């Protein structure tokens, strides 16, 4: 398990949480010095539990698939909540079984469905540690529309930050003031699968991507990533989605 407390949180403690989160994900090899997530894991070992505490010390436990860092569901007091998708229903066989009741959320966990439920794209949803505190509080009591927005915040401030050092840093900058994600942040989130694939394809292609990945950089300028010498590969990405899951 890993834990994060919003009470007394600062960029340092958040950095420690994201480090813990990354380190809780198993891998047997690195590709270009980046941990390669496993093709599969059987049983309960597939799911990492993240214990998150809001500023007041109330808590949810979030279940995360360790092969892809996808959030499957969460536990709030005695109620479990899972995304309406087969991977989450499968997860519900292994985690939070002691919950008094299980609610299946009225959407899957992918960005497009969540944004539809929340009534806005995540370009317009502020993120940061204060937003995470709010998200935790929102998820404590069921409200599916509110929860969609909270989950967009949660996914980006946990999973996406674990995947990309740039995103971790963006959240650290928003430790005491929320701000909508940078266009670069959105670009990286959208490109994680693609990048993971091309980095793995580069292993037998002399470090060269079979297909270039287009990203937006820190200054809003759109760029092409063509090989493993790019800063996105050497410095930024921290976890690779196994190509067997792409
Ligand atoms: C690879 O990427 C580097 C750094 O971005 C770039 O300058 C160069 O043109 C590319 N080289 C090859 C062989 O693709």
How many beta-strand elements?
A: 10
Distance between the termini: 26 Å
CATH superfamily of the largest domain: Ricin (A subunit), domain 1
CATH topology of the largest domain: Ricin (A subunit), domain 1
Outline the biggest β-sheet: 6 strands, mixed
CATH class of the largest domain: Alpha Beta
| Proportion of residues in extended strands | 15-25%
Put simply, the count of helices is 8
Helix-strand pattern: EHEEEEEEHEHHHHHEEH
Bin the helical content.
25-40%
CATH architecture of the largest domain: 3-Layer(aba) Sandwich
Cofactors and ligands: 2-acetamido-2-deoxy-beta-D-glucopyranose
Organism: Momordica balsamina
Binding site for adenine 2: 71, 109
Binding site for adenine 1: 70-71, 109
GO biological process, one term: negative regulation of translation
What does this structure look like?
The chain has 246 residues and is an alpha+beta fold. The protein has eight helices and ten strands. The strands form three sheets. The protein has a six-stranded mixed β-sheet with strand order 1-4-5-6-7-8. A hairpin with a 2-residue loop joins β6 and β7 (79-82). α1 packs antiparallel against α6, α3 runs antiparallel to α5 and α5 (144-163) packs across α6 (165-173). The two termini are 26 Å apart. Guanine binds at residues 71, 109, 160, 163. Its EC number is 3.2.2.22. GMP binds at residues 70-71, 85, 111. Belongs to the ribosome-inactivating protein family. Type 1 RIP subfamily.
């Amino acid at each position: 398990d890993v834990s994060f407390r919003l009470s007394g949180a600062d960029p340092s403690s958040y950095g420690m949480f994201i480090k813990d989160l990354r380190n809780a994900l198993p891998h047997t090899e690195k590709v270009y010095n980046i941990p390669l997530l496993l093709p599969s894991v059987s049983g309960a070992g597939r799911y990492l539990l993240m214990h998150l505490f809001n500023y007041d010390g109330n808590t949810i436990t979030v279940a995360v698939d360790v092969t892809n860092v996808y959030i499957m569901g969460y536990l709030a007091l005695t109620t479990s909540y899972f995304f309406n998708e087969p991977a989450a229903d499968l997860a519900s066989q292994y985690v939070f079984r002691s919950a008094r009741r299980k609610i299946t959320l009225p959407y899957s966990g992918n960005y497009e469905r969540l944004q539809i439920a929340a009534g806005k794209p995540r370009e317009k949803i502020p993120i940061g540690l204060p937003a995470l505190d709010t998200a935790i509080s929102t998820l404590l009591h069921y409200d599916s529309t509110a929860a969609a927005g909270a989950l967009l915040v949660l996914i980006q401030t946990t999973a996406e930050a674990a995947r990309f050092k740039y995103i971790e840093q963006q959240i650290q900058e928003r430790a005491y003031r929320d701000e909508v994600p940078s266009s670069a942040t959105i670009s990286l989130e959208n490109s994680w699968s693609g990048l993971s694939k091309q980095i793995q394809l580069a292993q037998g292609n002399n470090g060269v991507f079979r297909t270039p990945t287009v990203l937006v950089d820190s200054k809003g300028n759109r760029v092409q990533i063509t090989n493993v010498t790019s800063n996105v590969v050497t410095s930024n990405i921290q976890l690779l989605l196994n190509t067997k899951n792409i």
